[PDB]
Amino acid sequence: KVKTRIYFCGGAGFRIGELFHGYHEDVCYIDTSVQNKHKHNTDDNTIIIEADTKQTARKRAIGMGKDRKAAAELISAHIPAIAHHFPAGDTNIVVYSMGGASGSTIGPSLVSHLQQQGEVVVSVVIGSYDSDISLRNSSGSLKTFEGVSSVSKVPMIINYHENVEGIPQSMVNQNILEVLNALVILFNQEHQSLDLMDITNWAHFHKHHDVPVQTVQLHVCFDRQEAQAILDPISIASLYTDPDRDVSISTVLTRTTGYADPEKYDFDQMHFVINGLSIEDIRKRLEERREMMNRAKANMR
Ligand SMILES: Nc1nc2c(ncn2[C@@H]2O[C@H](COP(=O)(O)OP(=O)(O)O)[C@@H](O)[C@H]2O)c(=O)[nH]1
């Protein structure tokens, strides 16, 4: 098994994968049309699941209407095939927008399948509210998250980014790139005192502490302060280049701790904090911000 397999799904996924090209080898792409393909998609790393046009309206409903029910109908028979062509790694990262129809159905469907096979999985996702469609789909995706946790009986881990009004998608994408780079490092199995089983136990915290299975949020923090401010942590993994200064025995006992080689890594410390996720809180925010946008009728010049 590769150490980390990344699955880029739908339009946002393809765009991020394009930006991430060269940062990791074991990546792949899945979509419901060819329209999002770019120079790095090939038959070896890309699967396209399309309506058998042997269906103009249905494709329009999926592609332009972003009808998630229609999209999920289209892709559901092919999910096990995807995992067969693009085998799961020791860790897996699935990347998708919540507001469209392809990523927001392929992605969580894949996460569910992989978790049912016992795999460690993280999603890096994007909430949006640029339209009524985006808002409704993003709300639906939050509920899909709870269904993945319930169906697969493994906590679905969500690293959440939001398309805030006035912030270019290119800057959200760059934040996602930094997260992807951090995860690849965390998962590379090259650090002292951090093995495959340590990461598996951090992610599948339900098998080791018996908190109920629930959807959870992953926060990636690049300094001690960000990490500490996170409310009610459930499971934390931390990587330090200066344990002599920063790591006590209490930290080792209460946290998934690893030592990164200061001869090789340039960061001080990285914290990967899993805590509870309230889909209700995120839905309300998206709705409030959509209303504020509607009332503003404003563009940043
Ligand atoms: N941050 C970010 N958002 C995106 C990107 N592409 C699309 N979006 C937003 O994601 C939502 C769904 O788009 P998309 O991923 O293309 O839909 P899909 O192909 O059906 O899964 C819309 O709100 C888009 O504005 C991207 O590259 N970066």
Numbering used by the authors: 4 to 57, 61 to 307
What does the original paper state about this entry?
We solved the structure of crystals of ΦKZ TubZ to 2.0 Å (R/Rfree = 0.17/0.21); the asymmetric unit contained a single subunit of the protein in a monomeric state. The GTPase active site within the subunit was occupied by GDP, which was retained by ΦKZ TubZ through the purification process, and only the extreme N- and C-termini and a single region of surface loop T3 (residues 58–60) were not resolved within the electron density. The monomeric structure of ΦKZ TubZ exhibits several clear and interesting differences from those so far obtained for other tubulin/FtsZ family proteins. In terms of primary structure, there is a significant insertion within tubulin homology loop T3, which forms an α-helix instead of the conserved extended loop found in the majority of tubulin structures. Given the role of T3 in forming the subunit–subunit interface within a canonical protofilament, this would preclude formation of such a protofilament without significant rearrangement of the secondary structure. This is not the only such surface change, as the H10–S9 loop within the activation domain also lies in a conformation that would clash with an adjacent subunit and the partially disordered C-terminal tail prominent in previous TubZ structures lies across the subunit interface, blocking polymerisation. Combining structural information from both homologues, we propose that Pseudomonas TubZs may occupy a different conformation as a free monomer, surface loops being incorrectly ordered and the C-terminal helix and tail extending flexibly in solution as found in the monomeric ΦKZ structure.
